[PDB]
Design a protein around this nucleic acid. Structure first.
Ligand SMILES: [Zn+2]
Ligand SMILES: [Zn+2]
Ligand SMILES: [Zn+2]
Length: 92
DNA sequence: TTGCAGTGCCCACAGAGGCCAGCAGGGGGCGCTAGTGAGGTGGTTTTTATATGTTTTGTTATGTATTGTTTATTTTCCCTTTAATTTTAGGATATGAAAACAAGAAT
Protein backbone atom coordinates (compact mmCIF):
# COMPACT_ATOMS: atom_id res chain seq x y z
CA UNK A 1 0.00 0.00 0.00
CA UNK A 2 3.02 2.33 0.14
CA UNK A 3 2.81 2.32 -3.66
CA UNK A 4 -0.75 3.62 -3.40
CA UNK A 5 -0.09 5.93 -0.41
CA UNK A 6 -0.39 9.62 -1.44
CA UNK A 7 -0.90 8.80 -5.12
CA UNK A 8 -3.74 8.67 -7.65
CA UNK A 9 -5.24 5.66 -5.90
CA UNK A 10 -8.64 5.53 -7.64
CA UNK A 11 -8.88 5.28 -11.43
CA UNK A 12 -12.07 6.12 -13.35
CA UNK A 13 -13.65 3.65 -15.76
CA UNK A 14 -15.03 6.07 -18.37
CA UNK A 15 -12.06 8.48 -18.50
CA UNK A 16 -8.45 8.37 -17.36
CA UNK A 17 -8.67 11.07 -14.68
CA UNK A 18 -7.65 9.84 -11.23
CA UNK A 19 -8.23 11.09 -7.67
CA UNK A 20 -6.77 10.04 -4.32
CA UNK A 21 -10.16 10.06 -2.53
CA UNK A 22 -13.29 7.93 -3.05
CA UNK A 23 -15.62 10.90 -2.48
CA UNK A 24 -14.00 12.44 -5.53
CA UNK A 25 -14.91 9.27 -7.45
CA UNK A 26 -18.61 9.59 -6.55
CA UNK A 27 -18.69 13.27 -7.55
CA UNK A 28 -16.67 12.54 -10.71
CA UNK A 29 -19.07 9.71 -11.62
CA UNK A 30 -22.17 11.92 -11.36
CA UNK A 31 -20.84 14.19 -14.13
CA UNK A 32 -20.61 11.23 -16.52
CA UNK A 33 -23.96 9.73 -15.43
CA UNK A 34 -26.03 12.85 -14.62
CA UNK A 35 -27.93 12.40 -11.35
CA UNK A 36 -27.80 16.02 -9.93
CA UNK A 37 -30.07 15.31 -6.94
CA UNK A 38 -29.19 18.53 -5.08
CA UNK A 39 -31.65 21.38 -5.48
CA UNK A 40 -31.79 25.03 -4.42
CA UNK A 41 -34.75 25.66 -2.11
CA UNK A 42 -35.65 28.93 -3.87
CA UNK A 43 -35.04 28.28 -7.59
CA UNK A 44 -35.30 25.46 -10.13
CA UNK A 45 -31.53 24.85 -10.35
CA UNK A 46 -30.33 21.28 -9.78
CA UNK A 47 -26.73 20.94 -8.64
CA UNK A 48 -24.26 18.11 -9.10
CA UNK A 49 -21.66 18.82 -6.36
CA UNK A 50 -22.29 19.21 -2.61
CA UNK A 51 -22.94 22.31 -0.42
CA UNK A 52 -20.84 24.68 -2.61
CA UNK A 53 -24.10 25.00 -4.53
CA UNK A 54 -25.94 24.93 -1.17
CA UNK A 55 -23.82 28.08 -0.77
CA UNK A 56 -25.43 29.01 -4.12
CA UNK A 57 -28.83 28.61 -2.37
CA UNK A 58 -27.67 30.64 0.65
CA UNK A 59 -26.26 33.67 -1.32
CA UNK A 60 -28.66 33.77 -4.30
CA UNK A 61 -31.47 34.25 -1.76
CA UNK A 62 -29.97 35.95 1.38
CA UNK A 63 -29.81 39.81 1.32
CA UNK A 64 -26.77 39.39 3.62
CA UNK A 65 -24.55 38.20 0.76
CA UNK A 66 -21.88 40.81 1.73
CA UNK A 67 -19.15 40.52 -0.97
CA UNK A 68 -15.79 40.58 0.87
CA UNK A 69 -14.14 43.88 -0.18
CA UNK A 70 -10.64 42.28 -0.38
CA UNK A 71 -8.99 45.63 -1.09
CA UNK A 72 -5.71 45.66 -3.06
CA UNK A 73 -2.81 48.10 -2.70
CA UNK A 74 -2.62 51.79 -3.66
CA UNK A 75 -5.36 51.94 -6.33
CA UNK A 76 -7.75 50.11 -3.97
CA UNK A 77 -10.26 48.76 -6.50
CA UNK A 78 -12.23 45.70 -5.37
CA UNK A 79 -12.36 42.34 -7.18
CA UNK A 80 -14.35 39.18 -6.32
CA UNK A 81 -11.44 36.72 -6.93
CA UNK A 82 -8.04 36.24 -5.23
CA UNK A 83 -6.14 35.60 -8.48
CA UNK A 84 -7.34 38.95 -9.83
CA UNK A 85 -6.00 40.81 -6.78
CA UNK A 86 -2.63 39.05 -6.97
CA UNK A 87 -2.22 39.74 -10.71
CA UNK A 88 -3.35 43.37 -10.56
CA UNK A 89 -1.25 44.01 -7.38
CA UNK A 90 1.96 42.64 -8.96
CA UNK A 91 1.80 45.82 -11.09
CA UNK A 92 -0.16 48.34 -8.98
C1' DT B 1 -18.63 36.40 -16.19
C1' DT B 2 -20.78 31.21 -14.80
C1' DG B 3 -21.62 25.96 -14.67
C1' DC B 4 -19.24 22.03 -14.80
C1' DA B 5 -15.29 18.72 -14.04
C1' DG B 6 -11.51 18.02 -11.78
C1' DT B 7 -7.65 19.37 -8.05
C1' DG B 8 -5.50 21.06 -3.33
C1' DC B 9 -5.40 21.39 1.24
C1' DC B 10 -6.56 21.13 6.06
C1' DC B 11 -8.46 18.57 9.53
C1' DA B 12 -9.42 14.56 12.29
C1' DC B 13 -10.67 10.13 13.88
C1' DA B 14 -9.29 5.77 13.03
C1' DG B 15 -5.97 2.48 12.59
C1' DA B 16 -2.00 0.78 13.74
C1' DG B 17 2.19 -0.79 16.13
C1' DG B 18 5.94 0.16 19.31
C1' DC B 19 6.22 1.18 24.35
C1' DC B 20 5.39 -0.26 28.82
C1' DA B 21 3.92 -2.49 33.49
C1' DG B 22 1.93 -6.56 34.99
C1' DC B 23 2.05 -11.30 35.55
C1' DA B 24 2.69 -16.20 34.97
C1' DG B 25 5.85 -20.15 33.19
C1' DG B 26 10.08 -23.37 34.21
C1' DG B 27 14.24 -23.85 36.57
C1' DG B 28 18.82 -22.86 39.77
C1' DG B 29 20.64 -22.22 44.37
C1' DC B 30 20.29 -21.54 49.48
C1' DG B 31 18.42 -21.48 55.07
C1' DC B 32 17.00 -24.63 58.23
C1' DT B 33 15.36 -28.83 60.46
C1' DA B 34 12.93 -33.70 62.05
C1' DG B 35 13.98 -38.21 61.94
C1' DT B 36 16.12 -42.19 61.31
C1' DG B 37 20.28 -45.15 60.36
C1' DA B 38 24.46 -46.89 61.52
C1' DG B 39 28.76 -47.17 63.94
C1' DG B 40 31.62 -46.95 67.99
C1' DT B 41 32.42 -47.13 72.99
C1' DG B 42 31.49 -48.48 77.61
C1' DG B 43 29.42 -51.46 81.00
C1' DT B 44 27.90 -55.56 82.45
C1' DT B 45 27.67 -60.12 83.12
C1' DT B 46 28.86 -64.17 81.89
C1' DT B 47 30.82 -67.78 80.56
C1' DT B 48 34.53 -70.25 79.88
C1' DA B 49 38.39 -71.51 82.10
C1' DT B 50 41.77 -72.41 85.80
C1' DA B 51 43.42 -73.76 90.36
C1' DT B 52 42.75 -75.45 95.18
C1' DG B 53 40.81 -78.33 98.67
C1' DT B 54 38.34 -82.27 99.95
C1' DT B 55 37.06 -86.76 99.29
C1' DT B 56 36.94 -91.07 96.93
C1' DT B 57 39.26 -94.77 94.81
C1' DG B 58 42.95 -97.92 94.30
C1' DT B 59 46.76 -100.32 96.13
C1' DT B 60 49.46 -102.60 99.81
C1' DA B 61 50.40 -105.29 104.07
C1' DT B 62 49.03 -107.97 108.10
C1' DG B 63 46.23 -111.25 110.57
C1' DT B 64 42.98 -114.85 110.65
C1' DA B 65 41.00 -118.90 108.99
C1' DT B 66 41.03 -122.96 106.06
C1' DT B 67 43.08 -127.02 103.93
C1' DG B 68 46.33 -130.22 103.91
C1' DT B 69 50.44 -133.78 106.00
C1' DT B 70 52.89 -136.70 108.27
C1' DT B 71 52.79 -138.61 112.60
C1' DA B 72 50.31 -140.83 116.50
C1' DT B 73 47.70 -142.48 119.90
C1' DT B 74 43.17 -145.16 119.40
C1' DT B 75 40.99 -148.87 117.78
C1' DT B 76 39.66 -152.67 116.12
C1' DC B 77 40.17 -156.90 113.54
C1' DC B 78 42.39 -161.27 114.08
C1' DC B 79 44.86 -165.08 116.41
C1' DT B 80 46.47 -168.90 120.53
C1' DT B 81 45.82 -169.49 125.66
C1' DT B 82 43.68 -169.74 129.80
C1' DA B 83 39.37 -169.08 133.81
C1' DA B 84 35.11 -169.40 134.70
C1' DT B 85 31.18 -171.93 133.52
C1' DT B 86 28.27 -175.11 131.99
C1' DT B 87 26.59 -180.14 131.29
C1' DT B 88 26.43 -185.15 132.39
C1' DA B 89 26.55 -189.02 135.16
C1' DG B 90 26.90 -191.31 140.17
C1' DG B 91 26.26 -191.38 145.02
C1' DA B 92 23.87 -189.91 148.79
C1' DT B 93 19.65 -187.78 151.14
C1' DA B 94 14.93 -187.19 152.56
C1' DT B 95 10.42 -187.30 153.17
C1' DG B 96 6.57 -189.97 151.94
C1' DA B 97 3.76 -193.68 152.11
C1' DA B 98 2.55 -198.19 152.35
C1' DA B 99 3.09 -201.96 155.69
C1' DA B 100 3.31 -204.20 159.68
C1' DC B 101 2.45 -204.00 164.60
C1' DA B 102 0.05 -202.71 168.64
C1' DA B 103 -4.14 -200.56 170.85
C1' DG B 104 -9.39 -199.60 171.57
C1' DA B 105 -13.69 -201.19 170.41
C1' DA B 106 -17.35 -204.23 169.22
C1' DT B 107 -19.78 -208.75 168.62
ZN1 LIG C 1 -14.56 9.73 -15.69
ZN1 LIG D 1 -31.31 29.44 -5.66
ZN1 LIG E 1 -4.52 48.06 -7.15
Amino acid sequence: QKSHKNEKRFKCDQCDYACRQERHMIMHKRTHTGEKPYACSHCDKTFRQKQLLDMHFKRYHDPNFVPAAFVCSKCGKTFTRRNTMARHADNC
